[PDB]
Write a protein that binds this ligand. Structure first.
Ligand SMILES: Nc1nc2c(ncn2[C@@H]2O[C@H](COP(=O)(O)OP(=O)(O)O)[C@@H](O)[C@H]2O)c(=O)[nH]1
Ligand SMILES: [Mg+2]
Lengths: 160, 151
């Protein structure tokens, strides 16, 4: 996004990657390697769904996770199992219980929500943004050649 | 024979078992991995199937040949209780397979089964597992008596 340092963006990405590393650390109650596989490879068992580019949304509140539009496949981690709420309308849903002695546990709850009806807009914003920029730079009008058919130009374009 | 043998399958079964560890040797737990095994389970029997580390159709061919081995660890008893979720992949396969074996023993037993409601996968599994129990009731000519608990 305009005005944001690559350093800032990179920091955000690394912090999200760590949440995924945490997710797949195999140390959570109720959460299998097969649970993770079937979350992200959701078309394997839900054959009526279309494989395509999907977005992963990584949220730390129920509210933010519920606001992911048209959620397909959802994985929730909770440190406090009392806070588990089966929210949203995904086709696939799983929950894992994090351990308070897991030093990698950074947040009290983390939701990993996959959808696909969001990539469109993202692309549009890029196309629209580029179009506007190109329009300002495109609307150009070069001047007439400084050389006429009068000048004696040789094969290398030398005029002596 | 013991008075009663309690059998738990899948994550939900493992989770319910934690509340019954005081029953000790009478409790027998089964799963396809150890995601739900906790410290208190040391007080009861726990057996995990081999080569199985949510999809019942996938889990079935892997666990079926192991059932006889699982059954050898379950003592003859005057009554059995079986407990699992209808909506996952492991409990809803191990549970009914063991149930079929108990019917072959001409056993008296009841089951406690959970109706999982999170997703269309859960709901589809719930349906197929209830149908499984119906098919078993017919094939073994025996009532399959369950206490059904919807989430
Ligand atoms: N009542 C209850 N339901 C559960 C519990 N854990 C999971 N569920 C629900 O049951 C479904 C199956 O989970 P689980 O029994 O762990 O699956 P399995 O290990 O493949 O047999 C989940 O998708 C949840 O909807 C539990 O401890 N109690
Ligand atoms: Mg399980």
């Amino acid at each position: 996004t305009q005005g944001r340092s690559y350093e800032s963006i990179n920091d955000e990405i690394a912090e999200k990657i760590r949440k995924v590393v945490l997710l797949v650390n195999q140390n959570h109650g109720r959460l299998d390697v097969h649970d993770v596989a079937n979350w992200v490879r959701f078309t394997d068992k839900h054959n009526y769904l279309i494989p395509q580019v999907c977005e992963l949304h990584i949220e730390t509140t129920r509210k933010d996770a519920e606001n992911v539009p048209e959620a397909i496949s959802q994985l929730s981690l909770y440190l406090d199992p009392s806070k588990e709420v089966a929210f949203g309308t995904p086709i696939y849903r799983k929950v894992g219980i994090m351990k308070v002695d897991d030093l990698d546990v950074t947040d009290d709850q983390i939701h990993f929500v996959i959808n696909s009806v969001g990539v469109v807009e993202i692309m549009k914003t890029i196309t629209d943004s580029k179009l506007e920029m190109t329009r300002q730079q495109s609307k150009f009008t070069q001047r007439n050649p400084i050389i006429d058919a009068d000048d004696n130009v040789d094969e290398d374009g030398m005029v002596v | 024979p013991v008075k009663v043998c309690l059998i738990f399958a899948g994550g939900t079964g493992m989770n319910v078992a934690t509340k019954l560890v005081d029953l000790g040797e009478a409790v027998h737990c089964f799963d396809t991995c150890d995601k739900n095994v906790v410290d208190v389970h040391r007080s009861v029997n726990v057996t995990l199937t081999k080569g199985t580390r949510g999809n019942r159709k996938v889990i079935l061919p892997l666990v079926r040949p192991q059932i006889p081995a699982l059954m050898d660890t379950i003592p003859e008893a005057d009554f059995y209780i079986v407990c699992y979720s209808l909506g996952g992949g492991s409990g809803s396969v191990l549970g009914p397979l063991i149930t079929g074996q108990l019917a072959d023993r001409k056993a008296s037993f009841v089951s406690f089964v959970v109706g999982a409601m999170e997703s269309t996968d859960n709901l589809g599994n719930d349906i197929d597992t209830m149908k499984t129990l119906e098919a078993i009731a017919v094939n073994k000519h025996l009532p399959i008596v369950v206490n059904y608990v919807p989430n």
